[PDB]
Symmetry: D2
Subunit: 492 residues, 4 copies
C-alpha cells in the first residue's frame, strides 16, 4: 500500500517527493511506502484547518454527528479491509484485529452520541439583574498524533470527539502504521467531511515533529505514545499554549491476593501480558502474587504461557513486535535483567521460525522470577511480552510497591476481600484499577493516569469535554446607572 | 515587615539565612525583608507536604472545610492588618485594598462551601455484573505561585480550593509581595492547618524557580503571572508531568458600539484601564469605539482621565506601579509608541508629585488616538495605565479585530443590541466577556482564557475540580468464569 | 384501519372482542376500529412488563439503544405510511404530518443517544473508609398515556426514554388516535423489542382509565393530556405512589413589545395560533400587544388570518378539530365570549366548505379585540383557533398579566430590548419562553410548566432522567469494630 | 411551654382562641399547649409568603445563605435549650437529643453551602443563531409538614433547602412536637429572615390538614410522615398540582449473611431496631439471618436487648413511645402477632415502672421468632421497638424476600462477600442500602425510596434541586426573516 497526504480537500504527494518505507513485522520485508510530508505541507494542512473552522463550528454538533455516524456506517460495512490492513501492518492475530475494529466502531458511535448534550451553564451574577453564562465551544485547530500499537483504535479515539465538538483536525499517525489511519480518513471524507476539516499528514518525526506541535496556529494537541515524545511535546507546545491531552507510558502492577480466584486471575494475566504482544499502554508490567499462592500461581502461568502460539495472524495467539528497534530494545532489556542476576523462568529470546516468518520481529513470552522492586524491569516500561514476578505478604506493602512507580496508568487486582477492593480504590494511585477482570478500557471510562502518564484523559463525558473550552459571559441588564466602588460618581 | 519561611509546622529561617529586600512602590525606600529559601528549603517543604498528604486526605473535605472557615473568620476579624500590608507593599488606594480583602473572604467562603459536593461518578460497565466507579481524588502536592498584582486575592484563590480538595501545598509568592501572603499563611496556621499541609517559601526566581516546578514530587502547579514565566514552567514541568493551571497575560479589547450607554461605558473604562494602575490580567488593553461616537467618547475619556488623582493610598484614585522595572518598561512602551508616530492625546509620562512620592513608581494615564491594529501597543501586554483607541464600523470587523490577538482572557462590550450580545457570546473568542458592566470576575465564574493566556482555569465548579484527578475502578462481580475473546478457554 | 392489542409478545384481540369506532375529523365518517381492552387485558400487559423487567434491565442501555435505533431506521424507511395515518386520523395538513414524523425520528435518535451517559454518583461518606454510591436505575413498569393532538410525536416522546433507561412499558393511546400509536409499536416489535417489554392497550377511559393508573404494580405514569384527567390520575396514583410525569394544559401569552419585528411576530403568531388548528399545548392562547402598535398589528393579523385555507390535508393551511365534542365545545366558548360583549374582529364559526368536508369538524380563525383579562377566553384553555388580544403599556404590567394564569407552559416574546429579554427570562413564570421565534420545543429542552401544567417534564438530560430512580448504597470498609455513639461499647 | 403562631412577621394567637394540649411521653402529664390555628390563620400565612416571595427571590442565594448560616450559629450557640425541648417533648435519651441537634446544625450548614452552585444550563438550539437557556428558579410557596419522630432534624431538613433556593415557607409541625419547631423558627427570625418569608402554623389535622395542602396558592409540599397522610396529600394536591416531596413509611429488611462480622451486625441491629425506640423511617423492621448463624445470632441479640435500659432521658438507652395512641397500636400489633402463633422471644408489653414514669408510654424491646413472611409484622410498618426474625439460605431468596414489601426506604446488609455487595446494590430495590454499617442518612445522600415510600427525595444535590423548577428560554438572534415550514411566506 502506498499511502498519500490529504491536505485541504485533496489527496496529494509530499512536496519534496520523498517517502518512507513500511516493513511487515511478520515477514521483515518492505510492503508499502508513505509520503514524507515537508513543513510547507504541514503549514498547508494547518492553514486549511484554520480556514474551515468557522463553517465547521457553525454547522452545529447535530449536523456534525450525522457525518460522523455516516463514517461509522461505511467503516462497519467495509470492516474486513481495515482488519486486513491491521493484520498486515502490525501482524496482529485476526481476533485482535477484529476486536480493535469493533472498538473503532464503538468509539465513533459513543462520541457522536454526545451531540447537543455537552451543555454549558448558567450561574448567578452579583446582583438580581446580572447573570454569568458559561458556553462550551471548540478549541480550534487540533493536532492529533496517534501511536503504532492500536493504529485504528487510536485514530477513532481522537478524531471522533475532536470533530463532534466542532474542532478541525490535522492527523499525523505513526510512520510504522500509516495504512490504517489513511483508510479511516478516507471513510470520513466519503462520509462528507467538508474541505479543510480533516487533514492527513505522514512524515518523519525528525523533520516535522517539533514543527507541527510548536506551530503558531495550533490550539490543542491530542497524543498517545512514548513518554519521552510527550515530554518534548509539552516543551515545544509552550510556544502556543496548546491545550494538552497526552497519554504516555504505563507500568501496570498486576496484584493477586491470597484469596484470588486463580483461574480468572490467570486468564486475565495471559490477556494482560500477551495481548498485542505486550504492546499496550495497560499491559501487565509487574506481577505481585501473595506468598501463600506464589509458587502454584507461577507454575501455572509458565505452563499456560508455554501453550501460546506465535506466528501468522490467521492462527497465532500472539504476534510479532512492530519493528527491528522494538526487537533490539526487548533483547537488550532481557540481557540487562540477566546481567543483574534475574532468573528467567521461560522465554527471553527470539525464536528461530521458518519460511518468511524467520525474518519477522517475533519474541517469546518471557517470565522473570524474584525480580528486584528497584530493577529496570520493575521501574522502566517494557512494551513487550516480558514480565517479572515478586512475592507480597500484606495489603500496605502491596499498595506501597504498586505506587512506587513513575507511571500511573492501569493496574490489576484479584481478591475476594471487599475491604481491599474499596480501600485500594483510593489507595492504588492509578488512573485505572481493574478488579477481578481484564481490560481493555471502555468508551465511557476516563482513560488517564497519574505521574508520568501525561495530561488530561480520553473517554467518558470528561474526555470528550477536554476538546471544549469553557467561556464566560457576564451580563448586566439592570438598565440603571452603574456604581463602581473605586470610581468617583462625582466625575459624572 | 520581616517575613520568614514556614516549613513542616514551624516558622524557620532560610537554610543559610540569606534575605531579599522589599521596596515601597510609593516612596522607593526599603521597608521590608524576606528569607531567600534554598534548594534544600524547597526540598524540606515538598517532603513535608508529601508526608502530610495521607492524613490530610483522610481527614475528609468536611473537616478540612472547618479549618478553612476558621481561617476566613480569623481573616475577617483582623482584616485591617491585611488591608494595611497591601497598601504598604503595593501602594493601592484604600478602596482597592479593602475590596481585595473582601475578595479574599468571599473566595475562601465560596471554595470551602464545596465540601462533600464535588462528586465522583458511576458508569455502566460492559455487562450487567460490571460497573465503572469514577472517584475524584486529590493530585497530591500542589505548588502555588502567586503574582504581585493581587497579592492577597491570588493566595486565597489558590490555597482555598487546593486545600479543600485534599491536596497539600507549597506556596511561593512574588518577591515583590511576601507580606500579604505570609499574613494569610499565618492565619491558616492559627486556624489549625496540620503540620506539613501548608508550607510557605520565598526566594529569588533565578535561584529556586526552575527547581520548584521541575521537582520529582510535585503533582500540580497553579500559577498566575507573566506569559514568559508560564512558558518556562510548562517546559520545566515536562520533568514531572504535573497538572498545570496557568493564568498568564491578557490583552482585553474594550468595545463600545454606537448604541452604548455612554456614561456606563466611560465609568467602566475608567475602572478597566486605571484600577490597580492597569496592573490587572483583565485591564482594558485596546479600545475599539464605533465611528459615530468615537470623537465624543475619546474627548470625554480624556477629560475624565485628567481628573484622576495619583499618590498616597489614603486619597488617590490611582496608585503607583509595583517596582522600578515596571516603570522603566512602561516608559519604553510609551517611547516606542511615540516613535512609531502614535498620537498622544493625554499624558504619557510620570506625574509631577511632591515629597516622598516623587521617588515612587507613578505613571500618568496615557491615551493614544487612532492606534494601529498591528502595533506593539495593540499586540503586546502593557500592564500599566496606557491604552490606544481605534474606530470600528461593523460587527464582523469588531469580532475579527478582537480575535486578532495572541491573548484571550477578558473583553468588554457596551451595546443595547441583543443580537450582537448573543452572537458575540460565541464570536468573541475570549475567556471572559463583560457585557454592559465592569469586572472583576466572580468566584462562580471560570476565570480562564484562550491562546497564550495559559492552561485550565480558576473559579466555579470547574476551577475547583482542576485540583481533583478522576480515576476509574472497573469491577466484575459476576462471580463466574471469565471469557476473553482473544484467550482460548480450552487452555482451562 | 383496524387496530389490535399487543400483549406479552403477541398481537391479540380484546379478552371479549369488544371494539370502539374511529371517525375522520375531515369527513365525519367511520374509518377504523380498535380493540376495547378489559381490566383483565390490562393485568396481562402489566404482568408481562413485570416479568420482562429484569432481563430488559440486564440487557444494558447500549443493547437496548440498538433496538431503539433499529426502530428509528424502520420508521424512517417507511415514514410515508405514518404520515398518511396522521393525515387520515387527525386531518393535519401534509406539512404538519411530515413535520410530526420528522420529530418522531429526531426524538427516538436523541433519546437512544443517552446510552451509557446518565451516570450515577459517588459521594464522600462520614469517614475515610466510607462511601455513598448513588445508582440511577429504572423505576420498573411505566404506563404511557398519550393524547390525540400529536399522536405520533407523543408516543416517541414517552417510549424512547422509558425503554432506553430500562423500564418496561404499557402504552395506551387516545381512543381518537390508535393507528399512529399501533404503527409505531409495530415498528419497535419489528426492531426486536423482547416479549413483555412493550405492551399496547386501547380502550375507553371510562372503563379502564382509573384501573390502569391505580394498579398495584405500576411504578411510573407518563401522561400528556387534559388538566382534569391529570388531576384524576394524581388522585388515583395515590394508591401506588407512582412517579408522575404529567403534561397538562397551557394558556400561552403571546407578547409583542413596541420594538418587535412586526413581520416576524406576525409569522410566528400565525404558526402559534393556527398550527394543528390551535390544538397544541403551546398554542398562543392570549395576545398582548404594545399600545403603540396594537392597531396596525391586529389589522394585519386579521388580514393574514383571512387568507388561511381550511380543508383537505393535501392543500389546506389548517386542518379540522379532532372530533364533534371539540367542535361543540369551541362553538360554546365563542358563544360565551359573544354574550359577555366581546368584540369579534374575524370569524367565529364553522367555515363554509363543499362536499365531504361540510361534515368535518372545521372551525374558522377567530380573533377577538380588546379582551378582558379575567374572562373565560383569557383564563380557560381553548385548544382551538380562537384568541383575544389586549393592549399593554409597561413591562411590569406585561409580566403580571402573563403570570396571572393558572397555567404555565409556553409563552412568546417579541422585542429588540435586551434588558426585557434577560429580565423576562426570570420574571415570566413559564416553562418555556420563545424569544423572537416560534416553537415547537426541541428534544434538548425540558418541556415542562409551572402551576396547573403538571408534574416533572420531558426532554433534555433532565426529562430522560425522570425515568430513573436514584438509590444510595452506604458502605463501610474500615474492617474495624463499629462505634455508634448511642450504643454502649461495654455491652461488647 | 405554650407555643404560638408566626404569621406575616408577628407572633400571634389562633384567631379562634383555641389550643391543643401537649403531653409528656415520659410522665403522661400535660406539659404544654399550642395554638390551634384556623383556616383564616392559614390563609393569612400563605398570603404573607406570597407577598414576600419576589423580594426573597431577588435577594439572591448568597444573601439568603448569610441569614441561614446566621441561624445555624444561633442554634449552635444555644443548642442545650433545643436538646432539652427534645428530651421533654419526645422523651429521647440525652445522646439522641444531642445527636439530632448535631444533625440540625450539619444540615443547615450543608444546604446553605449550595449558594450560587445549583447552576442552570446552556444548550444548542436548532440553528447556529439560536440557544436554549435553562434557568433553575424557586417554585414559590412551600408548605413544609414535619413529623414528630425527629422534630428538630426534620424542620432543619425542609426549611434550609426551601429557603436557600428562594422559596417562601409555611411550616406546620406535628401537634405532638410544636416546641422544637417553634424554637428553630424563632432562631431563623432572630437571624434576620424577612417578614412573610417563614410562617409557623400549628393546629389539628382535622381542621386545617386538607385546607393547607389543597390551597390555591401553594406551589410545593414537602412532607414526612405516615403513608396514609401522604396518600391524602397527593389526592388533595391535585387541586393545585403542587410539586410533591413525600417521605412516607418504611419497612427496612435487616439482612445478615453467613459470613457477617457478628459483633458489628449486632451493634448495628441494636441501633437500627432501638434508636428512638424504633420510631424511625429507617428502623430495622424485619430480620433475616442466614440459617448457619441464626440461633447464635438470635441468642446474642436477645441477650443484648435484655441489657437495654428504658426510662429517663438522663440515663436510659431507650425512651418511650410518643403518645397513648402509639402505645395502644403497638400492643394491638403484638397481640395480633401472638394470635397468629408467632413466638415472642422477649418483651411484648409495657413494663410497670414507678414514680412519674408509671404513666409514660414505655414499651419493652420485643423480639419475635419464626415470623411468617406474609404476616402483619412483616408486611405493615410497626414504628416501635418490635421485630420478627426469619431464616434464609440463599442470596436470590434474600433479595426476593426483601423486595416483597410495599415499602422501599432503607435496608441493611452484613456480609464479607464482595459479589453479594455489588449485586445487591442493584438487586435490593430500596432507596438506601446500608452495608456493614448503621444509619442514619447523611446530608449528601438522597433520602428516598421505591414503592409506597413516596415522591422525590431529600438531601444531596438532587434533594435540594427538588425545590428548584427548571425553565427554558429559546432565543433567536439571527436578525433575519423567519421561515416557518407550515406558514406560506407568500402571505408576506
Amino acid at each position: 500500500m502506498d499511502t498519500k497526504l490529504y491536505i485541504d480537500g485533496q489527496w496529494v504527494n509530499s512536496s519534496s517527493g520523498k517517502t518512507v518505507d513500511k516493513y511487515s513485522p511478520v515477514t521483515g520485508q518492505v510492503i508499502g511506502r508513505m509520503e514524507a510530508a515537508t513543513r510547507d505541507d504541514v503549514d498547508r494542512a494547518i492553514d486549511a484547518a484554520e480556514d474551515a473552522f468557522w463553517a465547521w463550528n457553525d454547522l452545529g454538533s447535530v449536523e456534525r454527528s450525522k457525518i460522523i455516524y455516516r463514517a461509522k456506517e461505511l467503516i462497519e460495512k467495509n470492516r474486513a479491509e481495515l482488519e486486513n490492513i491491521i493484520m498486515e501492518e502490525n501482524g496482529k492475530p485476526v481476533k485482535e484485529a477484529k476486536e480493535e475494529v469493533d472498538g473503532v466502531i464503538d468509539q465513533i458511535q459513543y462520541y457522536a452520541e454526545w451531540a447537543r448534550k455537552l451543555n454549558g451553564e448558567v450561574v448567578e451574577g452579583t446582583s438580581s439583574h446580572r447573570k454569568i453564562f458559561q458556553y462550551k465551544v471548540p478549541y480550534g485547530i487540533v493536532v492529533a498524533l496517534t501511536p503504532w500499537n492500536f493504529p485504528a483504535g487510536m485514530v477513532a479515539r481522537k478524531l471522533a470527539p475532536a470533530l463532534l465538538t466542532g474542532n478541525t483536525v490535522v492527523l499525523k499517525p505513526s510512520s510504522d502504521t500509516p495504512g490504517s489511519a489513511e483508510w479511516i480518513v478516507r471513510k470520513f471524507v466519503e462520509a462528507g467531511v467538508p474541505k479543510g476539516v480533516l487533514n492527513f499528514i505522514t512524515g518523519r518525526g525528525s523533520e516535522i515533529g517539533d514543527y507541527i506541535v510548536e506551530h503558531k496556529k495550533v490550539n490543542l494537541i491530542t497524543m498517545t505514545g512514548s513518554t519521552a515524545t510527550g515530554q518534548r511535546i509539552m516543551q515545544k507546545a509552550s510556544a502556543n499554549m496548546a491545550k494538552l491531552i497526552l497519554e504516555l507510558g504505563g507500568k501496570a502492577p498486576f496484584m493477586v491476593w491470597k484469596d484470588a480466584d486463580m483461574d480468572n486471575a490467570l486468564k486475565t494475566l495471559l490477556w494482560a501480558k500477551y495481548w498485542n504482544a505486550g504492546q499496550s499502554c495497560i499491559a501487565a508490567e509487574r506481577l505481585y502474587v501473595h506468598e501463600d499462592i506464589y509458587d502454584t500461581f507461577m507454575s501455572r502461568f509458565v505452563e499456560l504461557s508455554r501453550k501460546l502460539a506465535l506466528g501468522d495472524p490467521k492462527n497465532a495467539d500472539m504476534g510479532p513486535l512492530i519493528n527491528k528497534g522494538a526487537l533490539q530494545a526487548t533483547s537488550e532489556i532481557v540481557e540487562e535483567a540477566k546481567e543483574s542476576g534475574a532468573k528467567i523462568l521461560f522465554g527471553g529470546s527470539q525464536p528461530s521460525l521458518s519460511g518468511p516468518y524467520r525474518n519477522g520481529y517475533f519474541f517469546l513470552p518471557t517470565i522473570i522470577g524474584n525480580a528486584d522492586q528497584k530493577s529496570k524491569i520493575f521501574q522502566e516500561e517494557i512494551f513487550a511480552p516480558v514480565i517479572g514476578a515478586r512475592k507480597i505478604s500484606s495489603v500496605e506493602e502491596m499498595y506501597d510497591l504498586a505506587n512506587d512507580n513513575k507511571y500511573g496508568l492501569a493496574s490489576y487486582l484479584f481478591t475476594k476481600d471487599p475491604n481491599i477492593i474499596f480501600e485500594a480504590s483510593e489507595r492504588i494511585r492509578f488512573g485505572e484499577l481493574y478488579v477481578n477482570m481484564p481490560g481493555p478500557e471502555a468508551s465511557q471510562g476516563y482513560h488517564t493516569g497519574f505521574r508520568m502518564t501525561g495530561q488530561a484523559g480520553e473517554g467518558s463525558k470528561y474526555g470528550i469535554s477536554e476538546y471544549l473550552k469553557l467561556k464566560n459571559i457576564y451580563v448586566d441588564y439592570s438598565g440603571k446607572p452603574l456604581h463602581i466602588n473605586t470610581v468617583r460618581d462625582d466625575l459624572f
